[PDB]
C-alpha cells in the first residue's frame, strides 16, 4: 500500500499546474486524500482534503486557488492556479483515515518550482585525492554536481550498493542562479587500485543521467 506524487515541474508564474497522486493497495471509496506542501527549508503546510464522496475542503489561505478531483480508482489530481514563487515547494499526498491530516502513509513528494528561469542540466566533476596514500588508511572520494536548474538532483554510489560513509550535501544556490551539489564517500585506501567507486547522478528535469567513476589522480 503506497502513494506516489507526480507532475511537479518548473513553470512560469501564472501557469496552471496539475499534480497527480497515484495510489496502490487501498480504495479511494474508503479513504480520503490529503495534500500537504513544504517550501525549501521550511515547515509542513496543509493544503486540503478530498473525501470518499469527492467533497473537498481547503486551508483558509487557499482561497479557491486549489482544486482536488478523483480522476480514476487510483488517481487524484491537485489543480493549482495563480501560482507565484511563494508556491515553490515539495508537494505531498497522504492517505486520510478521516478529515484529520494524521496518517502513517505518505508519498515521497514531487517538487514544484515557480520561476521564469530556464532548465539547465549539470556537469559532473570528480572530487579526487592526489594519491591513494594522501590520508592514511581511509580515502575520501566525491562528485561535484555543478550548475543545474531547477531542483532536484539525486546521487547514489555504486548503483545503490554503497550507502555507508556516504554524505550527500544539500544543494547550494550559486550567485549565478544555478544550483550546485556535492556528494562524498569515505573508503579504504588499500584497495583503491582495483575497487570501483561510481556516483550515479540524475537530473530528471533535463534528462541528464551521468555515472562518474572517481579515483586518485595519477602523477
Amino acid at each position: 500500500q503506497s502513494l506516489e506524487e507526480s507532475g511537479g515541474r518548473l513553470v512560469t508564474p501564472g501557469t496552471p499546474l496539475t499534480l497527480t497522486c497515484t495510489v496502490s493497495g487501498f480504495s479511494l471509496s474508503t479513504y480520503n486524500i490529503h495534500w500537504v506542501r513544504q517550501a525549501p527549508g521550511k515547515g509542513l503546510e496543509w493544503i486540503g482534503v478530498i473525501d470518499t464522496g469527492g467533497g473537498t475542503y481547503f486551508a483558509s489561505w487557499a482561497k479557491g486557488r486549489f482544486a482536488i478531483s478523483k480522476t480514476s480508482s487510483t488517481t487524484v489530481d491537485l489543480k493549482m492556479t495563480s501560482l507565484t514563487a511563494a508556491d515553490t515547494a515539495t508537494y505531498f499526498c497522504a492517505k486520510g483515515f478521516d478529515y484529520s491530516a494524521s496518517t502513517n502513509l505518505w508519498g515521497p513528494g514531487t517538487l514544484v518550482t515557480i520561476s521564469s528561469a530556464s532548465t539547465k542540466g549539470p556537469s559532473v566533476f570528480p572530487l579526487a585525492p592526489s594519491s591513494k596514500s594522501t590520508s592514511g588508511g581511509t580515502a575520501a572520494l566525491g562528485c561535484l554536481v555543478k550548475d543545474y536548474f531547477p531542483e532536484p538532483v539525486t546521487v547514489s554510489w555504486n548503483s545503490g550498493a554503497l550507502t555507508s560513509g556516504v554524505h550527500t550535501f544539500p544543494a547550494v544556490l550559486q550567485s549565478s542562479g544555478l544550483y550546485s551539489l556535492s556528494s562524498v564517500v569515505t573508503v579504504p585506501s588499500s584497495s583503491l587500485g582495483t575497487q570501483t567507486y561510481i556516483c550515479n547522478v540524475n537530473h530528471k528535469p533535463s534528462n541528464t543521467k551521468v555515472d562518474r567513476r572517481v579515483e586518485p589522480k595519477s602523477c
Partner: protein, 217 residues
Amino acid sequence: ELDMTQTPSSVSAPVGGSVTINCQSSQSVYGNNYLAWYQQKAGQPPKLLIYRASTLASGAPSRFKGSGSGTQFTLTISDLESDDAATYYCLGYYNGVINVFGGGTNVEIKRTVGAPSVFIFPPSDEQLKSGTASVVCLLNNFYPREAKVQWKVDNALQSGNSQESVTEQDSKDSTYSLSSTLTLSKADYEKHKVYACEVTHQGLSSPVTKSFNRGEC
C-alpha cells in the same frame, strides 16, 4: 486566523536523556484530543508518531509519549537514541475541517566533541576546460556543528568566493559533515601555486591545514 505555537524551536540532549516538545493552540482542537505528532528527516515525508494526543502509531517505539487536552499538548521523547535526531511537528485538526501544523522543533543529540577528518580536492582537468575552477574542502564526521574554513591561495586569505553546505545530524554517530567550495576563474587558478584549506574546530587544539600545489600531484 488560529495559531499553533510549537516550542522550543530547537533543543539539544544526550543519548539516554529526554526532551519535551510543546504545542499550544489558540483554539481547542477537535474533540479536545485531535492532535498528532510527526518526525521528519531530510528528503523524506514525515512519519507519524502519535495521534489523538496520546495514541502511539503502529511501529513507533515506546519512548515517544504524547499527552494533553484542549489547547495544550506535549511530546516527550525519553531514552534518546542517535536515530531520534530529526525535526518534529505537531498537527492539530479543528472544527470547520481545518488542519494546522506547528512550526517545528529540531532535536539534536548532544555527544562528545569529535574532531573533523579533513580532505582537500583540486579542480578537475575536465572542469578547467570550461573556464572555472572549483576547489573543495571536506570536513567529515565532527561534533559540534560549528566549524570554520579559511582558504588560502599563495598565503592570501580568501573572502567572498566560498560557499558551505552541512548535512543533517547523522542518525548513527550523531556527527555533522561540511563541504566548502572555493570558486575561482580558471585564469585566477592558473596564476597561483599553493592552495590550502585551514580548519578551526573545538575538537582541534589548533587549526589543521591541508594543502596542494597546482599541477604537482
